[PDB]
Scaffold this active site. Structure first.
Site, mmCIF file in Angstrom:
data_model
loop_
_atom_site.group_PDB
_atom_site.id
_atom_site.type_symbol
_atom_site.label_atom_id
_atom_site.label_comp_id
_atom_site.label_asym_id
_atom_site.label_seq_id
_atom_site.Cartn_x
_atom_site.Cartn_y
_atom_site.Cartn_z
ATOM 1 C CG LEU A 22 -1.798 -1.101 1.225
ATOM 2 C CD1 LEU A 22 -2.648 -1.134 2.779
ATOM 3 C CD2 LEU A 22 -3.064 -1.232 0.137
ATOM 4 C CD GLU A 30 -9.460 0.452 4.367
ATOM 5 O OE1 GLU A 30 -8.701 -0.131 3.978
ATOM 6 O OE2 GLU A 30 -10.649 0.561 3.486
HETATM 7 N N1 LIG Z 1 -5.350 -0.292 -2.228
HETATM 8 C C1 LIG Z 1 -5.882 -1.363 -2.563
HETATM 9 O O1 LIG Z 1 -7.239 -1.492 -2.421
HETATM 10 C C2 LIG Z 1 -5.202 -2.332 -3.240
HETATM 11 C C3 LIG Z 1 -3.961 -2.383 -3.520
HETATM 12 N N2 LIG Z 1 -3.082 -3.501 -4.230
HETATM 13 C C4 LIG Z 1 -1.828 -3.112 -4.584
HETATM 14 O O2 LIG Z 1 -1.859 -3.121 -6.113
HETATM 15 C C5 LIG Z 1 -0.572 -3.806 -6.523
HETATM 16 C C6 LIG Z 1 -1.008 -5.197 -7.274
HETATM 17 O O3 LIG Z 1 -1.845 -4.859 -8.420
HETATM 18 P P1 LIG Z 1 -1.345 -5.088 -9.911
HETATM 19 O O4 LIG Z 1 0.062 -4.494 -9.948
HETATM 20 O O5 LIG Z 1 -2.388 -4.230 -10.514
HETATM 21 O O6 LIG Z 1 -1.443 -6.395 -10.320
HETATM 22 P P2 LIG Z 1 -2.626 -7.588 -10.310
HETATM 23 O O7 LIG Z 1 -3.064 -8.114 -8.986
HETATM 24 O O8 LIG Z 1 -3.901 -7.421 -11.348
HETATM 25 O O9 LIG Z 1 -1.948 -8.937 -11.201
HETATM 26 C C7 LIG Z 1 -1.109 -8.938 -12.254
HETATM 27 C C8 LIG Z 1 -1.240 -10.366 -12.849
HETATM 28 O O10 LIG Z 1 -2.460 -11.008 -12.337
HETATM 29 C C9 LIG Z 1 -2.818 -11.885 -13.728
HETATM 30 N N3 LIG Z 1 -4.182 -11.154 -14.174
HETATM 31 C C10 LIG Z 1 -4.406 -9.915 -14.052
HETATM 32 N N4 LIG Z 1 -5.698 -9.815 -14.679
HETATM 33 C C11 LIG Z 1 -5.978 -10.980 -15.315
HETATM 34 C C12 LIG Z 1 -6.969 -11.335 -16.120
HETATM 35 N N5 LIG Z 1 -8.074 -10.474 -16.622
HETATM 36 N N6 LIG Z 1 -6.947 -12.895 -16.624
HETATM 37 C C13 LIG Z 1 -5.980 -13.474 -16.134
HETATM 38 N N7 LIG Z 1 -5.000 -13.103 -15.484
HETATM 39 C C14 LIG Z 1 -5.002 -11.907 -15.026
HETATM 40 C C15 LIG Z 1 -1.731 -11.887 -14.612
HETATM 41 O O11 LIG Z 1 -1.018 -12.751 -14.250
HETATM 42 P P3 LIG Z 1 -0.195 -13.787 -15.357
HETATM 43 O O12 LIG Z 1 1.005 -12.940 -15.752
HETATM 44 O O13 LIG Z 1 0.566 -14.879 -14.535
HETATM 45 O O14 LIG Z 1 -0.857 -14.050 -16.618
HETATM 46 C C16 LIG Z 1 -0.874 -10.462 -14.417
HETATM 47 O O15 LIG Z 1 0.363 -10.034 -14.920
HETATM 48 C C17 LIG Z 1 0.148 -4.339 -5.213
HETATM 49 O O16 LIG Z 1 1.062 -2.921 -5.102
HETATM 50 C C18 LIG Z 1 -0.714 -4.165 -4.001
HETATM 51 O O17 LIG Z 1 -0.216 -3.802 -3.114
HETATM 52 C C19 LIG Z 1 -3.986 -4.552 -4.679
HETATM 53 C C20 LIG Z 1 -5.070 -4.931 -4.492
HETATM 54 C C21 LIG Z 1 -6.145 -3.724 -3.749
HETATM 55 C C1 LIG Z 2 -5.932 -8.692 -1.382
HETATM 56 O O1 LIG Z 2 -5.779 -8.371 -0.152
HETATM 57 C C2 LIG Z 2 -5.810 -7.325 0.599
HETATM 58 C C3 LIG Z 2 -6.049 -6.233 0.023
HETATM 59 C C4 LIG Z 2 -5.687 -4.913 0.835
HETATM 60 C C5 LIG Z 2 -6.112 -3.530 0.032
HETATM 61 C C6 LIG Z 2 -7.392 -2.984 0.341
HETATM 62 C C7 LIG Z 2 -7.455 -2.175 1.634
HETATM 63 N N1 LIG Z 2 -8.794 -1.703 1.913
HETATM 64 C C8 LIG Z 2 -9.718 -1.944 0.978
HETATM 65 N N2 LIG Z 2 -11.059 -1.227 1.418
HETATM 66 N N3 LIG Z 2 -9.942 -2.568 0.062
HETATM 67 C C9 LIG Z 2 -8.756 -3.347 -0.574
HETATM 68 N N4 LIG Z 2 -8.629 -3.922 -1.746
HETATM 69 C C10 LIG Z 2 -5.146 -4.888 1.919
HETATM 70 C C11 LIG Z 2 -5.098 -6.063 2.610
HETATM 71 O O2 LIG Z 2 -4.455 -5.924 4.038
HETATM 72 C C12 LIG Z 2 -3.808 -4.769 4.347
HETATM 73 C C13 LIG Z 2 -5.295 -7.560 2.163
HETATM 74 O O3 LIG Z 2 -4.831 -8.464 2.655
HETATM 75 C C14 LIG Z 2 -3.407 -8.858 2.857
#
Ligand SMILES: NC(=O)C1=CN([C@@H]2O[C@H](COP(=O)(O)OP(=O)(O)OC[C@H]3O[C@@H](n4cnc5c(N)ncnc54)[C@H](OP(=O)(O)O)[C@@H]3O)[C@@H](O)[C@H]2O)C=CC1
Ligand SMILES: COc1cc(Cc2cnc(N)nc2N)cc(OC)c1OC
Length: 186
Positions: A22, A30
């Site tokens: 994050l 949160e």
């Molecule tokens: N603030 C928040 O609410 C959240 C934040 N995060 C943050 O975001 C980052 C991770 O997200 P991000 O980098 O966007 O990557 P993703 O989690 O989307 O992962 C990317 C990989 O997932 C697979 N993938 C994604 N979409 C598809 C699809 N439609 N079909 C098949 N495979 C798919 C592919 O794997 P392959 O190459 O093997 O095919 C791709 O290379 C981290 O920094 C994490 O901490 C993540 C979730 C929520």
């Molecule tokens: C994919 O799992 C997690 C995702 C997030 C990001 C996140 C944090 N807050 C909200 N509301 N949505 C989200 N997607 C935060 C997390 O913990 C800090 C997770 O577990 C490790």
């Protein structure tokens, strides 16, 4: 499946990630909101399903994987089996939802939650039918390298309130944020 939910937390500059984690310090209540929303089902005999991309999966701490009390499905085009600890693997979102209708999951899934990353959110937000977006607005800028796609207000409505979701500005560790819920219907 007649409805999907997305859940995300996003900075003022639309950031959702930095360096595989994050952009902001850990906000404990949160995170507890994320765990409550994605885990809670009042339907006896069923569990919720969480869908995520591979980078999001590996961004979770090993000791917290799989997300407990939820069926964990990873999307990947390259893997042949789920990553270690995950329950299911699918090549696309459409394929994932279809999987829930097959025998193994047939009588098992309540709600479906999309939990990131960018490309998964983008695809989910354009999926046909009813969809809700649970968006936590972190009310500061944070340096980010991964961003949330734009919410199309032609399609999505900001709901004035939602049962079980606090309406006032929150604060933890000196950082203000608010919970929003958006909906589209098609
Ligand atoms: N603030 C928040 O609410 C959240 C934040 N995060 C943050 O975001 C980052 C991770 O997200 P991000 O980098 O966007 O990557 P993703 O989690 O989307 O992962 C990317 C990989 O997932 C697979 N993938 C994604 N979409 C598809 C699809 N439609 N079909 C098949 N495979 C798919 C592919 O794997 P392959 O190459 O093997 O095919 C791709 O290379 C981290 O920094 C994490 O901490 C993540 C979730 C929520
Ligand atoms: C994919 O799992 C997690 C995702 C997030 C990001 C996140 C944090 N807050 C909200 N509301 N949505 C989200 N997607 C935060 C997390 O913990 C800090 C997770 O577990 C490790």
């Amino acid at each position: 499946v007649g409805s999907l939910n997305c859940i995300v937390a996003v900075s003022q500059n639309m950031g959702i990630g930095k360096n595989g984690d994050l952009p902001w310090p850990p906000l404990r209540n949160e995170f507890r909101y994320f765990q409550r929303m994605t885990t809670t089902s009042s339907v006896e005999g069923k569990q919720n399903l969480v869908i995520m991309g591979k980078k999001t999966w590996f961004s979770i701490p090993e000791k917290n994987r799989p997300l407990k009390g939820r069926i964990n499905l990873v999307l990947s085009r390259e893997l042949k089996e789920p990553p270690q600890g995950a329950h299911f693997l699918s090549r696309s979102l459409d394929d994932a939802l279809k999987l829930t209708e097959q025998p193994e999951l047939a009588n098992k899934v309540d709600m479906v939650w999309i939990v990131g990353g960018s490309s998964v959110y983008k695809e989910a937000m354009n999926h046909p039918g009813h969809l809700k977006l649970f968006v936590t607005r972190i009310m500061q800028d944070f340096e980010s390298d991964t961003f949330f796609p734009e919410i199309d207000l032609e399609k999505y409505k900001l709901l004035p309130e939602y049962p079980g979701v606090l309406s006032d500005v929150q604060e933890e560790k000196g950082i203000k944020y608010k919970f929003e819920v958006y909906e589209k219907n098609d």
